[PDB]
A paper describes a structure:
Recently, we and others identified [name] ([name]) as a novel downstream target of mTORC1 and proposed that it plays an important role in the translation of [name] [name]. We have also shown that [name] associates with the 5’[name] motif via a [name] family-specific ‘[name] region’ located within its C-terminus. We show that the [name] region of [name] specifically binds the 7-methylguanosine 5’−5’ triphosphate (m7Gppp) moiety and the invariant first cytidine of [name] [name]. Biochemical analyses reveal that [name] selectively prevents the binding of eIF4E to the m7Gppp cap to block the assembly of the [name] complex on [name] [name].
Our observations of (1) a binding pocket complementary to the size and shape of a guanosine that (2) specifically recognizes its Watson-Crick face, and (3) sits upstream of the 5’ terminal cytidine of the bound [name] RNA led us to hypothesize that [name] binds the cap of [name] [name]. To test this, we determined the co-crystal structure of [name] bound to the cap analog 7-methylguanosine triphosphate ([name]) to 1.8 Å resolution. [name] binds the same pocket as G8* in the [name]-RNA co-crystal. Lysine-915 stabilizes the γ-phosphate of [name]. Interestingly, the γ-phosphate of [name] aligns with the position of the bound sulfate ion that crystallized at the non-crystallographic dimer interface in the structure of the apo [name] region. The [name] region of [name] stabilizes the nucleobase of [name] between two conserved aromatic amino acids, Y883 and Y922. In addition, E886 hydrogen bonds with the Watson-Crick face of the guanosine moiety, using acidic side chains for this recognition in a mechanism reminiscent to that of other cap-binding proteins (CBP20). The methyl group points away from the core of the [name] region in a manner similar to that observed in the nuclear cap-binding complex; it is therefore likely that other regions of [name] outside of the crystallized construct interact with the methyl group at position 7 and the 5’−5’ triphosphate linkage connecting the m7Gppp moiety and the first cytidine nucleotide of the [name] motif. While the α-helical nature of [name] is unique among cap-binding proteins, its cap recognition pocket exhibits the canonical architecture. (C) Superimposition of [name] bound to RNA and bound to cap analog, [name].
Author numbering: 794 to 945
The structure:
Amino acid sequence: HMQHPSHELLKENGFTQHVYHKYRRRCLNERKRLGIGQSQEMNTLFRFWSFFLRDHFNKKMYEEFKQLALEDAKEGYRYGLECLFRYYSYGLEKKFRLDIFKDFQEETVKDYEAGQLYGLEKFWAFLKYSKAKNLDIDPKLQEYLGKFRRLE
Ligand SMILES: CN1CN([C@@H]2O[C@H](COP(=O)(O)OP(=O)(O)OP(=O)(O)O)[C@@H](O)[C@H]2O)c2nc(N)[nH]c(=O)c21
């Protein structure tokens, strides 16, 4: 009776367009009314996307997740982007997608150049867990990953 909409939507047969649309609408409306980073309901949506897209990818949903996460991080509220990096690392481990991998590299490079390591650690973690071989890794990103190689 008290279960959160995101909890229902993450069940195997639990996702329905009707429930998700009403949930997404309220979250986005709260983000606009209360402001970026000020809506805890919006944070649950970031968390939902981070998990749900691993098993049920959809281009437009991912692109909205990505766009809002980056908007929030620019304002200084990084939960959305942390959810995105977790999606990249765990999601690409589950099923590799070339276009999503390219985004993963691009956002990791930006994250590192902004003085953060959360993205770089998640990329390094992906490399340790994934079975994917012959990856085409940005030469600049390989250089950044060199910091972690000397540590282990
Ligand atoms: C095995 N775990 C997992 N965990 C915490 O429970 C949550 C889910 O585990 P997780 O998603 O694998 O950690 P994760 O988020 O991927 O790594 P990180 O939080 O650094 O981004 C995370 O906040 C993780 O830090 C743990 N916390 C404590 N104190 N002890 C533990 O053994 C564990």
